[PDB]
Amino acid sequence: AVQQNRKSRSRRDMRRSHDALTENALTVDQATGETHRRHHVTKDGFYRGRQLFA
Amino acid sequence: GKHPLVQAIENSQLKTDLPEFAPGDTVVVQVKVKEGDRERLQAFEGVVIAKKNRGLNSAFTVRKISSGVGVERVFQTHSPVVAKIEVKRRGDVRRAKLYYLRDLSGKAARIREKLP
Amino acid sequence: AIGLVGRKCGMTRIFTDAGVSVPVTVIEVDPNRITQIKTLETDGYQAVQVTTGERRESRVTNAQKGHFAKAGVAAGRLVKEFRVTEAELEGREVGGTIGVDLFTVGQIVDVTGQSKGKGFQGGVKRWNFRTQDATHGNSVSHRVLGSTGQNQTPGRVFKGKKMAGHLGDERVTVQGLEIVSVDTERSVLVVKGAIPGATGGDVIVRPTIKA
Amino acid sequence: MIQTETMLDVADNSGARRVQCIKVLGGSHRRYASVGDIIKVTVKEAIPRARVKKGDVMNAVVVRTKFGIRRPDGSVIRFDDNAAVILNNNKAPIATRIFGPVTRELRTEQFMKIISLAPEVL
Amino acid sequence: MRHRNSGVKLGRTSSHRKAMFENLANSLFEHELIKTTLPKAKELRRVAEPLITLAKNDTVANRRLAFARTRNAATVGKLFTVLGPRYKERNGGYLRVLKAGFRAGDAAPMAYVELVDRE
RNA sequence: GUACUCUGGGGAUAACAGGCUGAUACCGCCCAAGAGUUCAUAUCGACGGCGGUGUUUGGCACCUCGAUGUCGGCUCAUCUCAUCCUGGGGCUGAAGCAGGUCCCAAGGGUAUGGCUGUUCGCCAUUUAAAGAGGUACGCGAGCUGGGUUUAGAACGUCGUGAGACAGUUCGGUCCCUAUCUACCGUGGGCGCUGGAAAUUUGAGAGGAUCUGCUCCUAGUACGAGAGGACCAGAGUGGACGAACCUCUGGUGUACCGGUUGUGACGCCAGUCGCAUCGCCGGGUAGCUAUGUUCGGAAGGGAUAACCGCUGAAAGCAUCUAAGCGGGAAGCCUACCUCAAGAUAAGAUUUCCCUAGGACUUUAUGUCCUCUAAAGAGCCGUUCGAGACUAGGACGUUGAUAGGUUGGAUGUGGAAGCAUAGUGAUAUGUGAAGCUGACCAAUACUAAUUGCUCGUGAGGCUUGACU
RNA sequence: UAAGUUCCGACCUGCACGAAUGGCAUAAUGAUGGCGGCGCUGUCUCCAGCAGAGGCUCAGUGAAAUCGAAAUCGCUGUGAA
RNA sequence: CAGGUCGAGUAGACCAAGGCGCUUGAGAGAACUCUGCUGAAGGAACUAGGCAAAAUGGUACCGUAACUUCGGGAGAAGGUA
RNA sequence: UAGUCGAGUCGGCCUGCGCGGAAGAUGUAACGGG
RNA sequence: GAACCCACUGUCGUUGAAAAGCCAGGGGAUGACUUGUGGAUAGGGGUGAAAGGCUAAUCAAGCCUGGUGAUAGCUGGUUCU
RNA sequence: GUGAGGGGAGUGAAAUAGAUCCUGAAACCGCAUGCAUACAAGCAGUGGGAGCACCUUCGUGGUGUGACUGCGUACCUUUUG
Numbered sequence A: 001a002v003q004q005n006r007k008s009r010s011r012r013d014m015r016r017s018h019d020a021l022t023e024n025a026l027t028v029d030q031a032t033g034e035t036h037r038r039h040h041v042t043k044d045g046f047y048r049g050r051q052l053f054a
Numbered sequence B: 001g002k003h004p005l006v007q008a009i010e011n012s013q014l015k016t017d018l019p020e021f022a023p024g025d026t027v028v029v030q031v032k033v034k035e036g037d038r039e040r041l042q043a044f045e046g047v048v049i050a051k052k053n054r055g056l057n058s059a060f061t062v063r064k065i066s067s068g069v070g071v072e073r074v075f076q077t078h079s080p081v082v083a084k085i086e087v088k089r090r091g092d093v094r095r096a097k098l099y100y101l102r103d104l105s106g107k108a109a110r111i112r113e114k115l116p
Numbered sequence C: 001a002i003g004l005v006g007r008k009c010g011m012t013r014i015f016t017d018a019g020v021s022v023p024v025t026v027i028e029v030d031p032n033r034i035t036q037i038k039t040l041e042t043d044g045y046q047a048v049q050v051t052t053g054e055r056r057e058s059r060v061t062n063a064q065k066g067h068f069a070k071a072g073v074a075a076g077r078l079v080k081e082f083r084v085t086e087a088e089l090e091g092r093e094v095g096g097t098i099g100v101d102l103f104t105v106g107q108i109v110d111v112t113g114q115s116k117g118k119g120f121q122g123g124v125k126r127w128n129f130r131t132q133d134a135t136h137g138n139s140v141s142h143r144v145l146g147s148t149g150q151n152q153t154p155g156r157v158f159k160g161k162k163m164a165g166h167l168g169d170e171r172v173t174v175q176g177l178e179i180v181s182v183d184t185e186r187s188v189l190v191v192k193g194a195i196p197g198a199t200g201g202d203v204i205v206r207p208t209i210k211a
Numbered sequence D: 001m002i003q004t005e006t007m008l009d010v011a012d013n014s015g016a017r018r019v020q021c022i023k024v025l026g027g028s029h030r031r032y033a034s035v036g037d038i039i040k041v042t043v044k045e046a047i048p049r050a051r052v053k054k055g056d057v058m059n060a061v062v063v064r065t066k067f068g069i070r071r072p073d074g075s076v077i078r079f080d081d082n083a084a085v086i087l088n089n090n091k092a093p094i095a096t097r098i099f100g101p102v103t104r105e106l107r108t109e110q111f112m113k114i115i116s117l118a119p120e121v122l
Numbered sequence E: 001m002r003h004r005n006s007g008v009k010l011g012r013t014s015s016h017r018k019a020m021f022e023n024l025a026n027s028l029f030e031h032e033l034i035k036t037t038l039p040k041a042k043e044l045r046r047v048a049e050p051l052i053t054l055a056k057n058d059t060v061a062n063r064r065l066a067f068a069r070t071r072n073a074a075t076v077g078k079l080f081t082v083l084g085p086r087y088k089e090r091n092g093g094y095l096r097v098l099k100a101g102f103r104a105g106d107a108a109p110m111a112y113v114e115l116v117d118r119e
Numbered sequence F: 001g002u003a004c005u006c007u008g009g010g011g012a013u014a015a016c017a018g019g020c021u022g023a024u025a026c027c028g029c030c031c032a033a034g035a036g037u038u039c040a041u042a043u044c045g046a047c048g049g050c051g052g053u054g055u056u057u058g059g060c061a062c063c064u065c066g067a068u069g070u071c072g073g074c075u076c077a078u079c080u081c082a083u084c085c086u087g088g089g090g091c092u093g094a095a096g097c098a099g100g101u102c103c104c105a106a107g108g109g110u111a112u113g114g115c116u117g118u119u120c121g122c123c124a125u126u127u128a129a130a131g132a133g134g135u136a137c138g139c140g141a142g143c144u145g146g147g148u149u150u151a152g153a154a155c156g157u158c159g160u161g162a163g164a165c166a167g168u169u170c171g172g173u174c175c176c177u178a179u180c181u182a183c184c185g186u187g188g189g190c191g192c193u194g195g196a197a198a199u200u201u202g203a204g205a206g207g208a209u210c211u212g213c214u215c216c217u218a219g220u221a222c223g224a225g226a227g228g229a230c231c232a233g234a235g236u237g238g239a240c241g242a243a244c245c246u247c248u249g250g251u252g253u254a255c256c257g258g259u260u261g262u263g264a265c266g267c268c269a270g271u272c273g274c275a276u277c278g279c280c281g282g283g284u285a286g287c288u289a290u291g292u293u294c295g296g297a298a299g300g301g302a303u304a305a306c307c308g309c310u311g312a313a314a315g316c317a318u319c320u321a322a323g324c325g326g327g328a329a330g331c332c333u334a335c336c337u338c339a340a341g342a343u344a345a346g347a348u349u350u351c352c353c354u355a356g357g358a359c360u361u362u363a364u365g366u367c368c369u370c371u372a373a374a375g376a377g378c379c380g381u382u383c384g385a386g387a388c389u390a391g392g393a394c395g396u397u398g399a400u401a402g403g404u405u406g407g408a409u410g411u412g413g414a415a416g417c418a419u420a421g422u423g424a425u426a427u428g429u430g431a432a433g434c435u436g437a438c439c440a441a442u443a444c445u446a447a448u449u450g451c452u453c454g455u456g457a458g459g460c461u462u463g464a465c466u
Numbered sequence G: 001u002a003a004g005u006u007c008c009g010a011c012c013u014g015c016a017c018g019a020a021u022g023g024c025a026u027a028a029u030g031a032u033g034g035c036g037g038c039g040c041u042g043u044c045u046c047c048a049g050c051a052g053a054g055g056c057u058c059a060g061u062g063a064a065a066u067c068g069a070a071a072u073c074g075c076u077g078u079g080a081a
Numbered sequence H: 001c002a003g004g005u006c007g008a009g010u011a012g013a014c015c016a017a018g019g020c021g022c023u024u025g026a027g028a029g030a031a032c033u034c035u036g037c038u039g040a041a042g043g044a045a046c047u048a049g050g051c052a053a054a055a056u057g058g059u060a061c062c063g064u065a066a067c068u069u070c071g072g073g074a075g076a077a078g079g080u081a
Numbered sequence I: 001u002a003g004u005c006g007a008g009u010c011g012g013c014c015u016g017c018g019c020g021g022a023a024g025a026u027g028u029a030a031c032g033g034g
Numbered sequence J: 001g002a003a004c005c006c007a008c009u010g011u012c013g014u015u016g017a018a019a020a021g022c023c024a025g026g027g028g029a030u031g032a033c034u035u036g037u038g039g040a041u042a043g044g045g046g047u048g049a050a051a052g053g054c055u056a057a058u059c060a061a062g063c064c065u066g067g068u069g070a071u072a073g074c075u076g077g078u079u080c081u
Numbered sequence K: 001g002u003g004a005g006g007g008g009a010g011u012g013a014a015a016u017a018g019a020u021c022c023u024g025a026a027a028c029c030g031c032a033u034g035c036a037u038a039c040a041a042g043c044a045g046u047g048g049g050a051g052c053a054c055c056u057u058c059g060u061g062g063u064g065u066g067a068c069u070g071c072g073u074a075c076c077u078u079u080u081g
Helices: A009-016 B004-011 B099-103 C062-071 D112-117 E014-031 E038-055 E060-070 E073-086
Strands: A026-028 A035-037 B026-035 B038-052 B059-066 B069-076 B082-089 C004-015 C021-028 C032-038 C047-052 C078-083 C108-114 C117-121 C165-168 C171-183 C188-192 C202-207 D007-010 D016-024 D038-046 D057-064 D076-079 D083-087 E033-037 E095-102 E109-115
Touching: B004 C004, B004 C021, B004 C188, B038 B069, B038 B099, C004 C047, C004 C188, C021 C171, C032 C062, C078 C202, D016 D083, D038 D083, E014 E033, E014 E038, E014 E060, E014 E073, E033 E038, E038 E060, E038 E073, E038 E095, E038 E109, E060 E073
Parallel strands: D007 D083
Antiparallel strands: A026 A035, B026 B038, B026 B082, B038 B059, B059 B069, B069 D076, C004 C021, C004 C202, C021 C188, C032 C047, C047 C078, C108 C171, C108 C202, C117 C165, C171 C188, D007 D016, D016 D038, D038 D057, D057 D083, E033 E109, E095 E109
8 A cells, every 4th residue: 555646844843743852851959050850860870869889 | 357346247247156077078958938928948969169257258169960960059158048067978078179089970070087 | 218328349249038149339438427418598599518538638628628617527638529309408417427227228329430441432432333244355444434525516524423432431320229238237238230440440329310 | 962963871661772863942053951850862772672662753851961961059950861751642641651761841731741750859 | 459569470380489589689788889670679679688587687597597688708798797787777668669761672661779878 | 279378459349347228127096707605805816908116137438457356154234115923903614712915014033953165055943033134145355265266186078189167076375564534432721701629400402112921800891612812910031231249160380288300409307499380289459251230211292093072064974174082112301321512602608819100002011129819730659540641549637559467368287396106107296387359446657848830809881679 | 954946866858978098896995076964163143361472662883665756634616628 | 524312314302523593682571463382061062164273093802884996895894901 | 756955056168387106225416506 | 114215185375484385184105115426318309107297486399699670551659829 | 882973182274174175066965043724626837915924224124934825738749720
């Protein structure tokens, strides 16, 4: 099965109308003040006033 | 039926005189039969092969040979129809369910007695 | 008619003196509190609104808080309406309570609930379609729908054709159920048979419409 | 649970030994027969010089089934064999002796003679 | 449908899944801090924590059961000499699972697994 | 001669299907020799005549040969009434039962097998009944490939032969990830006269409409006897449909045990890996039918055939022209479900927002400062909700999930030690040990500090009351 | 066989058998044609549960045949029908 | 060329010396499709046709029919440990 | 055949316009619609 | 009955892993057996336990070049006012 | 990232003459500005025609857009059509 006619650019864009991306949830962690992803450990191993590494 | 309200409703109907029996035993069950307006008691004798312990939902299966034809009946333990249970023999078996007895003939279907 | 909102607790059995085993369903009932009466003058139809259960304050919006405050009752997990007539509207005022005493042993009632969700389902389960042969050369067409229409006339698929889709998780009512027990102390109704939904679901009990 | 092509043993002294169900009576598209139902059977093996011959088409009533029957208290009764009893064209038993146990669902005016001649009823 | 079912699949045979989870438990008991995928970390609790509960009491039978489950003499010895005594007065919750972003190779979500009192 | 075939062309020209026509076919009506009745337009019905349909066999070659690709079976259907069953009537060589003919009625229902590739047809056994037809002789980008139509081979027949068939026989490749319309499910956006949370009315739409048997009236009405009711009431079945897991079962590769070969843990003992979950015996939750429960009620309005009341035209008669009535599984309601995108965008309860300055295109006009509430989302722990979504609960003022503790359940006598036995093994400690999803409690672990959106009292005209 | 257009046995009017383009029969042999039986079974009444691999969602890479152009609904009728 | 345990065996299961995990992954656990396991009662009622599936299966001993071209049929059938 | 009844009425032919005869399948679909 | 040589049934694949395969079954397996290296037979010819089979993914007359721009009463196309 | 790729500085008459380097068309694909567009059915134009934005000699003007409305089934070939 295949198309009988070539689709229009307008219809292609109408189909793509649902392709937009979305932002993640970013917050400032009070311990260090660096922006971090909500509910995740910071890149330096800090979370909820605890440091995993040494 | 593990919710407390269900447990209370079921506990309201539990029997309080059941004897202790185990699969290997031979038992006699007294069954109430009402014909017309007359009620009588009929005996059902056989070897227990399976026992489900589920409170008010408990049951036990009895197998016997009647004139060369095998008959199995599953009795609901707390049903009013079951009037009395009597344990005549106690056997010695190694498994909870004895379905293998269905394929064994008379002599091969013997169950050894448990001794004190 | 005036009914009751309750919760399905589970199934069990009842033994009669004769030895009959009756399967039954248990419904927990928190007495329903009246929050509003709708009348012809103001709403255009006659009805009684009730609430049941409890809800913590953080989960109650300000508007619903004001509504329950005007009613003079504590908030509940749900709010539901009962259509009624003038005769049964008597003796019912905002702030009152309706309990299990509304029913009697032996009465015939209808029970409404939400059926279990089966998700996406095919014709075999949704519409009892017959399967095709498992062997004798069948390639990939064991549980498929098969033919779906006629030829160039009419050259389409009609509305209402049965096809695979979502099954279950809908409102369902069962009629002709007999009340087996009314426990006032425990606030419980025991009904013969099965009622729709899963354990812990919300259910509605009403007098039988068919008499 | 008896259907077409099912073999049954004979619990009476009519002369037949094995029968095959060829139809379940009592309705359109009826699938199964249980204790007390009427079936159409053919005789496959008959004792020599008996009244019933091989290849005869007769009427019969199921008296024992392996699937079993349920009772009001919720119990189930099962048997080791599938057995029926032959009947005449008026649906009345044509035998003098009944072999093996039978059940109480036959306690009707139609089968009181089976009830009487059966050794054990349960 | 899967109404009221517990367990995971993770695209492995049952024996393979059991072996992988035992390896993860041994690594956790050895190191006390690991990084893995989030679903694996979440499933690892139901396997790792009962072992600590078992090791809370030191007997020949309990040690032999732990050896049957782990197949690692060093892990058994540590469980019955260090971790059990450390958590003797704790009612469960010996592990901590912390989300740690996503992994470059396949964008898979990741988490750290740590013992409650590591140092 | 080519079926071992090939190239250039044609729907200018056949086979299938569509189109026109209706000789043929089917159905209907008009007339009335005759038959039954040796007594009735009860039922047939000679010769002859007039119509309808497009279901048969045909006629014509208008469409397709830079392809509309196939008989039957399977799966799934929709419609017509010229009605097979069920429902309501008139007449009758209608005592009753039953039958014959004709009128009304399309709501529902409307077999399993043996023989044959068959559609058919014969047969056995059922049922209330096993109706006729249209839809590309419905349905092969949904399945099959038994027949029919390639290449092999054989018999019969024809031909000198290559070969061929008003014939027969064994064997013989079924492609396509769905763009558009259509359909079944499920979301996003905006709109609905400031915004928000919840409960709702019903214009309308869909679903469901089946039927056997027993008793009772009653051996009554009727009738030489035999035989046997209308009407009315109760019960119990078949098929179909829905929900559900208390009971009976199935499964249950994260539960328990028995056991074979082999390898390993230094060895014994005790364990683990592999061999279809190695094999075997049981089995908790969940899902499920063959298991359980429930339903097709009863009613109301109009009405078809038919039956009337009163009544003139037409002094009589007449169901009709005035007026007025009864009447069916048929129609509208009634029972279940959906339903205000019903742009006609409906109703009710409660809740939130009432700051300042500058400018000109003089206005629900712009710009700056200040202020962003009621709520809704993001995120997290999750679900008896789920393809993704959507939907439900909870987020420290917590029982949302995991773990822990205690029950329950299943399996059926753990390891170690001791004793008896030459040994295989048996007994005691002890119904012990272990036990996925179940129930109750518990803050031990995780649901942190948070961010974004959503504003600042809501134009104009007329009228009623303030 | 309950029911046999197939099969086995018998009849002979052979539409249109017949003797080395061989006739009748024959033990053994055949992934050879036809008919029947025991055991067995999810082939079926009538399907249910479970295991693996896809399907679905996320991240990376990234085809196909087709295509005059499209703001690409139903019914009835008309029309190279 | 090719070892160990059992084994008639270079068949088969698990291992030694040796070699390898094979150049997209992470989740979810719908319809539908492919592969596999179990299944109540019935047991070919399926279908052109038992197609496919199910079933039998080793060693030792006993016992084994019609018909034969006297070799066979013949591991006939069937039974015991 | 009478008559207590009191004036139209009985039966035909030729013509205009109407009535029955009149059943099919996708959806009113035999005035283009109102 | 393994290796080795074959290709009887069924499923999957049919823009395949593959321009002929995989999986589960199946046949021969001391012989008219299988197989390596090197040779002979050439197109109206060769070879053929015989299917018009094979003769480099091509066979009722191989492939390449030349006659050659063959012929075509056939189909298509044929450009500004 | 001591990568690729750019920005500044400098050369040159010229650097969108910067090394797949004269000019740089079309198909196809981005960004920005103005108008229209989420109650309405079809070869997408044509004849009318309100409103809006910009430029205005403010005009009976010019440039974009086009609510609402009548009419309206592409091109070539081949054909009786």
